[PDB]
Amino acid sequence: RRRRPLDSVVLQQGLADRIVKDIREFIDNPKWYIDRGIPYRRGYLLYGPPGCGKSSFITAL
Amino acid sequence: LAMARKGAQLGLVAFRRHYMITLEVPARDRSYAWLLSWLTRHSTRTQHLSVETSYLQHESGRISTKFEFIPSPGNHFIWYQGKWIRVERNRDMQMVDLQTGTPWESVTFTALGTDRKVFFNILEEARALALQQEEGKTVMYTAVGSEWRTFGYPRRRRPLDSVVLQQGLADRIVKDIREFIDNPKWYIDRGIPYRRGYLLYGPPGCGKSSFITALAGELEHSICLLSLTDSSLSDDRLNHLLSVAPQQSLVLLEDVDAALTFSGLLNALDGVASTEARIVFMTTNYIDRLDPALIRPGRVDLKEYVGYCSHWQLTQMFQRFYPGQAPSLAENFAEHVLKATSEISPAQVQGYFMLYKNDPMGAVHNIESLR
Amino acid sequence: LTFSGLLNALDGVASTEARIVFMTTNYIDRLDPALIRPGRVDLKEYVGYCSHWQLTQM
Numbered sequence: 001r002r003r004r005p006l007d008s009v010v011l012q013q014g015l016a017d018r019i020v021k022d023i024r025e026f027i028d029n030p031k032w033y034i035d036r037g038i039p040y041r042r043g044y045l046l047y048g049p050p051g052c053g054k055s056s057f058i059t060a061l
Numbered sequence: 062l063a064m065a066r067k068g069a070q071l072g073l074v075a076f077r078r079h080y081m082i083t084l085e086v087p088a089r090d091r092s093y094a095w096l097l098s099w100l101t102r103h104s105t106r107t108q109h110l111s112v113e114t115s116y117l118q119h120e121s122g123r124i125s126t127k128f129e130f131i132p133s134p135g136n137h138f139i140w141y142q143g144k145w146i147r148v149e150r151n152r153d154m155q156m157v158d159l160q161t162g163t164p165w166e167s168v169t170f171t172a173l174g175t176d177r178k179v180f181f182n183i184l185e186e187a188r189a190l191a192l193q194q195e196e197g198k199t200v201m202y203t204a205v206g207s208e209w210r211t212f213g214y215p216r217r218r219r220p221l222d223s224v225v226l227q228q229g230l231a232d233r234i235v236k237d238i239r240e241f242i243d244n245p246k247w248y249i250d251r252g253i254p255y256r257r258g259y260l261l262y263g264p265p266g267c268g269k270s271s272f273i274t275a276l277a278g279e280l281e282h283s284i285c286l287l288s289l290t291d292s293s294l295s296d297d298r299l300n301h302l303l304s305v306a307p308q309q310s311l312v313l314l315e316d317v318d319a320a321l322t323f324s325g326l327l328n329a330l331d332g333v334a335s336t337e338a339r340i341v342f343m344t345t346n347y348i349d350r351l352d353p354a355l356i357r358p359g360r361v362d363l364k365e366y367v368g369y370c371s372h373w374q375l376t377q378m379f380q381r382f383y384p385g386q387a388p389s390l391a392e393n394f395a396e397h398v399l400k401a402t403s404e405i406s407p408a409q410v411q412g413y414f415m416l417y418k419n420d421p422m423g424a425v426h427n428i429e430s431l432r
Numbered sequence: 433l434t435f436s437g438l439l440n441a442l443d444g445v446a447s448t449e450a451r452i453v454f455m456t457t458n459y460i461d462r463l464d465p466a467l468i469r470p471g472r473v474d475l476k477e478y479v480g481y482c483s484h485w486q487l488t489q490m
């Protein structure tokens with residue numbers, strides 16, 4: 001599929017930047033997990049009314 | 062001393078000449094056919110030519126052979142907008158192991174002029190030849206279970222002028238679908254699914270399925286035949302088939318009235334997890350069975366009615382079946398048809414002219430037989 | 433095979449172009465008159481026994 005830009009899914013201000021900073025911190029810091037014996041996994045939960053963009057945003061993210 | 066200098070001077074003189082001399086060398090990049098065919102056509106006065114034989118042995122005992130002539134090994138001089146051009150074609154001692162064991166071939170064009178605008182015109186002429194010669198064919202696809210397979214040979218494009226509908230009905234659909242293909246950027250930037258819905262409804266035998274066959278040929282697109290009366294078709298089967306459709310194709314549905322549930326059809330029509338560049342067409346002989354919520358924007362972007370033959374369709378079909386006649390002769394027919402018949406479907410007009418093949422005056426004088 | 437189900441079989445919309453079909457029947461007294469109209473049969477022709485012209489040529 002052609003990459004849907006992240007600016008197309010338009011959510012509230014500050015909501016996209018906090019998730020980008022947290023997940024970019026996870027990809028750019030792989031040493032913080034394994035060194036401490038923690039399973040190298042990250043959990044995320046998005047909840048809200050139907051059709052708000054939970055599955056839409058993940059397509060562009 | 063003198064001997065060494067002479068070799069150096071010639072090469073050095075060439076470098077200054079090289080700036081004032083153009084060089085082009087293609088090596089068996091499947092451009093030879095276009096350029097070489099143009100060379101013989103453009104010159105019209107040539108000596109050294111080679112023969113290439115085509116052996117189209119169709120499986121019927123019929124062997125069709127035609128000769129395409131191209132220049133042979135050697136040198137040629139040609140006349141163009143600029144001064145005389147030196148053309149040379151030379152063979153080498155190396156061999157190709159890919160296809161057939163042939164000498165590697167390089168063709169060189171040498172010109173006096175210092176501008177590179179000249180070859181730009183020559184190469185462009187070659188493109189015109191290749192696309193004019195070949196003619197596009199519409200490939201039909203049929204769903205074999207969960208996959209698509211080719212169905213017969215590539216059909217010859219039925220022209221769009223053959224299906225004769227009301228005035229402005231053929232032009233309105235062409236403008237809408239031509240606008241869709243040339244604007245792929247307007248969708249993704251705005252987060253809209255890059256899909257288009259179409260619905261054609263009307264009495265049976267009006268041309269709903271006929272028109273869609275001819276539309277793909279004009280747009281140089283293929284068709285994906287899919288009937289909604291199959292027994293091995295389910296809800297999940299349709300979601301897959303619309304996701305593995307070939308690019309530059311149109312999906313056709315025949316007689317949707319004879320259909321699968323309505324709730325499971327939502328993800329099939331507008332599915333987020335589906336491929337891009339997908340055009341779906343729907344044909345139903347009875348619009349009195351569809352849900353009003355099925356034809357909203359998002360699932361169907363254009364509602365269009367296809368009715369019986371009007372005065373516009375009768376005058377044109379008479380000119381199709383009897384070409385080269387005066388426009389006034391295509392009025393005596395349409396005059397008595399509407400005066401002698403109250404209702405007439407297009408399927409009956411296509412069959413009535415089969416009784417008077419190559420008999421124009423005979424179609425006008427025997428309209429009473431349609432009662 | 434039935435007679436009503438033979439309609440879509442003879443002239444199928446989902447079929448190739450440039451198709452020539454030949455039909456041979458030894459008994460014409462079982463077919464419908466509407467089956468041999470133009471569109472399905474474009475030329476009706478009877479083939480009988482040997483005439484005087486056929487005996488001289490054979």
Ligand SMILES: Nc1ncnc2c1ncn2[C@@H]1O[C@H](COP(=O)(O)OP(=O)(O)O)[C@@H](O)[C@H]1O
Pocket residue numbers: 008009010011049050051052053054055056057252253254333
């Ligand atoms: N925040 C948003 N910004 C832009 N478009 C959105 C947004 N949320 C949803 N959409 C649109 O809604 C449609 C489907 O959304 P969907 O992902 O099914 O919602 P959810 O997954 O939250 O149930 C898509 O076509 C998408 O473009």
Ligand SMILES: Nc1ncnc2c1ncn2[C@@H]1O[C@H](COP(=O)(O)OP(=O)(O)O)[C@@H](O)[C@H]1O
Pocket residue numbers: 223224225226264265266267268269270271272344346407408411445
């Ligand atoms: N508007 C039209 N103009 C020219 N020919 C038509 C038209 N409508 C139908 N036909 C002819 O009718 C035949 C079958 O039509 P079809 O596509 O089966 O109708 P529908 O799909 O609406 O039931 C074709 O041979 C076609 O040439």
Ligand SMILES: [Mg+2]
Pocket residue numbers: 051054055
């Ligand atoms: Mg959801």
Ligand SMILES: [Mg+2]
Pocket residue numbers: 266269270315316344346
């Ligand atoms: Mg139909």
